[PDB]
């Protein structure tokens, strides 16, 4: 950080205040630019702040005339995110004439997220990758701006591509810059232009690779001249990025002591950290600036103003971090559906004694209140309307409160309340009632909780299972409520679960009528269901549910069965698809196939068959020379029960084969040179006993031919007749290429022209070879070439004879 250090600032109205960024390379706080309502692109064209390198949130809002930060902040590298704005470390809001971001030198945002919203001129938003900027991208928020209602031309000029939704797109900042994507090996340490990973002490960028002195921004801590991991022992940590010795912390403490109105703090050294105040259990001697553990208990009491604080963001909770005794009430009003369990537990975890009421008004994203990890006793000295020390409302996703098998909560005064908690079962609410000691000593809505939650405390139990191929039968012990007519039927759910990843919260639902009731504990024809059909190897998760009519004065949740993972027994697999005979040698063929798309069972080894094929007879012979669900709940289930009960009231008056293992290819040797071959391949899955393979995959195969196969050996023995007919006999090739169908005979009188004759195999057999007719008298020559299924072999040796008139 070759520059000066300045605190956070807020700039508004006249642009002259923006000149206060004279030589500030790193800012010890947030930077805000706001309400520049009378500025044009002319004003922002010639102002730049390249010295700034690091920001500890950054917020821009309602700035007119500015088009881009490409010139304003060309070297802002890292935004730490120590103190977020709402839940975000960078906010760009209602920028009117902004066109592009231009923060190509921004590398990492350690903590928080980013929100750009309600712009009307910026572009290039879809061409930036946030996974390489901040870890948690699922909690970002860019909802409404330009290039979201009408796309821009985002001409990325240099710019590595990143995959999103399975498709690759290039990432760029402006029309002249692109995102710096360091390789995964460098991780957060960063890399230079050559791709060399920076030193572990660097974050994002470094002037020279593998040097803490050349880090653009220190990842862990910064000493007076170099990035360091934990600062030297004489230098304590400060603001999570600086290493400062006694002088700086002492000067800050003295300045705070001098100023009686500044919102400073009396800084203290603790655990090699200069911090505004050391946590509970430690007291300051006011002499050595080192706070020591206290004798009498001194909890970190945080006197809340106006007796009330509303928590709806990590910045609100962060104001209570390190607190142990809250001197006021507390409202939790998380919004948006973004999970905040980790930050809430980190900030409010040490809260033990709360001097007021606790209210959860509209916390939509909350799942549990476990983040009050050390919440021992609430006092309730300050109560809301109705005098409730614990309030719950509209918590849509709230599942459960503290783990009551482990927790121990005490409330002193006041009542509690619950309302519209659809995922909160009443059993947990009553456990809350009894564990806190409120009930009996001193509320819960009738039906607003667990409405969409499995409140069935009773557990069903499977009895017998029989799985086979595409069928499976289930059977569980009978269950009967006190009024057996209440049981409308059984609810069955099932899913295809490759692994254990289902927890009741996609299924296929099946309705089962109750079995006929039978007296005695005898066999009641144990209820069950027959599965319609399944894949021959899939694993399934199954559980059943009851369906019971509720009574106003009689609670009856029903029952459910624990989710059980059952995988059907295997069958024979399916035939592999796309086999090919990739013949490589005159006796070797490299068969290539790929596994079937539906193996219905793990492939252990392929079964290979190959049957020799005789050549076609044509070659040998031929001569070539919701209302409805509530509707069914009342007027034929409850109504049928009323008349039956009414009647009883009135009337009863009181007085060759090869197995290939883990390989998609096979090189079959010992094959013929060119003879056609038939191949059969099957997939097999459980063939430790006799084979149970699939059906055969069929391919015709043929090895590479050889010229020597069709070559005729030696000269041709000949005979001469007086009728100008010459008969000649030659040795047939021993191993012809598949089949020799015809022979090419070339004859020429000595020094004269050459003529050709076609002799077929039938002509070869009929005349016992060939017979040249019409030959002119004189010295003659003849040569023969053999034709096979592959081509033509070499000609015979020059044979010479004489023709007599």
């Amino acid at each position: 950080y070759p520059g000066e250090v300045c605190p956070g600032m807020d700039i508004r109205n006249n642009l002259t205040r923006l000149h206060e960024l004279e030589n500030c390379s790193v800012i010890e706080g947030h930077l805000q630019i706001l309400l520049m309502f009378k500025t044009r692109p002319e004003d922002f064209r010639d102002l730049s702040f390249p010295k700034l390198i690091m920001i500890t949130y950054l917020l821009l809002f309602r700035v007119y005339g500015l088009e881009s930060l490409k010139d304003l902040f060309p070297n802002l590298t890292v935004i730490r995110g120590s103190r977020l704005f709402f839940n975000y470390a960078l906010v760009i809001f209602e920028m009117v004439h902004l066109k592009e971001l231009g923060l190509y030198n921004l590398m990492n945002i350690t903590r928080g997220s980013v929100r750009i919203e309600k712009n009307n001129e910026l572009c290039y938003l879809a061409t930036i990758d946030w996974s390489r900027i901040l870890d948690s991208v699922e909690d970002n928020y860019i909802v409404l701006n330009k290039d979201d209602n009408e796309e821009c031309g985002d001409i990325c000029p240099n710019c590595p591509a990143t995959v999103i939704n399975g498709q690759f797109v290039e990432r760029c900042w402006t029309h002249s810059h692109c995102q710096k994507v360091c390789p995964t090996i460098c991780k957060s340490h960063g890399c230079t232009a050559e791709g060399l990973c920076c030193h572990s002490e660097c974050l994002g960028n470094c002037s020279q690779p593998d040097d803490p002195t050349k880090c653009v921004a220190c990842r862990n801590f910064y000493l007076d001249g170099r990035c360091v991991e934990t600062c030297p022992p004489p230098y304590y940590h400060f603001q999570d990025w600086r290493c400062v010795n006694f002088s700086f912390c002492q000067d800050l403490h003295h300045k705070c002591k001098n100023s009686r109105r500044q919102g400073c703090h009396q800084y203290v050294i603790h655990n090699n950290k200069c911090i505004p105040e050391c946590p509970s259990g430690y007291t300051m001697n006011s002499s050595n600036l080192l706070c020591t553990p206290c004798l009498g208990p001194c909890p970190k009491v945080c006197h809340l103003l106006e007796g009330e604080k509303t928590i709806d963001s990590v910045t609100s909770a962060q104001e209570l971090r390190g607190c142990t005794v809250i001197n006021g009430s507390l409202i939790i009003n998380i919004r948006g559906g973004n999970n905040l369990a980790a930050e809430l537990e980190a900030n409010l975890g040490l809260i033990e004694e709360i001097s007021g009421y606790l209210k959860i008004r509209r916390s939509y994203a909350l799942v549990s209140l476990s983040f009050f990890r050390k919440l021992r006793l609430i006092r309730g000295e300050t109560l809301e309307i109705g005098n409730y020390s614990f309030y719950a409302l509209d918590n849509q996703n709230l599942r459960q409160l503290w783990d009551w098998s482990k927790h121990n909560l005490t409330i002193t005064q006041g009542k509690l309340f619950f309302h519209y908690n659809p995922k909160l079962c009443l059993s947990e609410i009553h456990k809350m009632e009894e564990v806190s000691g409120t009930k009996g000593r001193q509320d819960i809505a009738l039906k607003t909780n667990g409405d969409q939650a499995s409140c069935e405390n009773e557990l069903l139990k499977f009895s017998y299972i029989r799985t086979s191929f595409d069928k499976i039968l289930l059977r569980w012990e009978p269950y009967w409520p006190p009024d057996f007519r209440d049981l409308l039927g059984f609810m069955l759910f099932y899913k295809e679960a490759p692994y254990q990843n289902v927890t009741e919260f996609s299924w296929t639902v099946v309705d089962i009528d109750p079995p006929l009731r039978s007296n005695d504990p005898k066999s009641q024809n144990h209820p069950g269901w027959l599965m319609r059909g399944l894949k021959p190897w899939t694993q399934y998760a199954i559980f059943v549910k009851t369906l019971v009519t509720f009574s106003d004065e009689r609670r009856t949740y029903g029952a459910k069965s624990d989710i059980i993972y059952v995988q059907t027994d295997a069958t024979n697999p399916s035939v592999p698809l796309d086999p090919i005979s990739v013949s490589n040698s005159s006796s070797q063929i490299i068969l290539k196939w790929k596994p079937p798309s539906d193996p219905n069972g793990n492939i252990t080894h392929y079964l290979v068959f190959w049957e020799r094929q005789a050549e076609d007879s044509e070659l040998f012979e031929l001569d070539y020379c919701t209302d409805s669900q509530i509707l069914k709940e009342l007027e034929e289930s409850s109504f049928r029960k009323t008349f039956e009960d009414y009647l009883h009231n009135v009337v009863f008056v009181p007085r060759p084969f090869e197995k290939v293992v883990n390989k998609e290819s096979l090189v079959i040797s010992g094959l013929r040179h060119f003879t056609g071959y038939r191949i059969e391949l099957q997939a097999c899955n459980q063939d430790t006993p006799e084979e149970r393979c699939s059906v055969a995959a069929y391919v015709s195969a043929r090895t590479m031919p050889e010229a020597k196969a069709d070559d005729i050996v030696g000269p041709v023995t000949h005979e001469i007749f007086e009728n100008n007919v010459v008969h000649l006999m030659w040795q047939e090739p021993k191993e012809p290429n598949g089949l020799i169908v015809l022979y090419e005979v070339s004859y020429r009188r000595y020094g004269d022209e050459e003529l050709h004759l076609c002799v077929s195999r039938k002509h070869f057999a009929l005349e016992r070879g060939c017979r040249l007719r019409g030959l002119s008298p004189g010295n003659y020559s003849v040569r023969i070439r053999a034709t096979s299924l592959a081509g033509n072999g070499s000609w015979t040796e020059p044979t010479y004879f004489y023709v007599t008139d």
């Binding site: 007519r485 007296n519 029960k641 039956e644 009883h648 009231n649 009863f652 008056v653 009181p654 007085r655």
Partner: protein, 46 residues
């Protein structure tokens, strides 16, 4: 608990040749809560 279907069966099995007497009620006494032979036999004809 004897409910709206087996209640008649149990009452018959208890009364037998006695028959049923004639000239809130029985469902709440025997279905909404458990009953005994004492209560069920009381409804038989004298």
């Amino acid at each position: 608990t004897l409910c709206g279907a087996e209640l008649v069966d149990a009452l018959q099995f208890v009364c037998g040749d006695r028959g049923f007497y004639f000239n809130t009620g029985i469902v709440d006494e025997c279905c909404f809560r458990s009953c005994d032979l004492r209560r069920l036999e009381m409804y038989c004809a004298p």
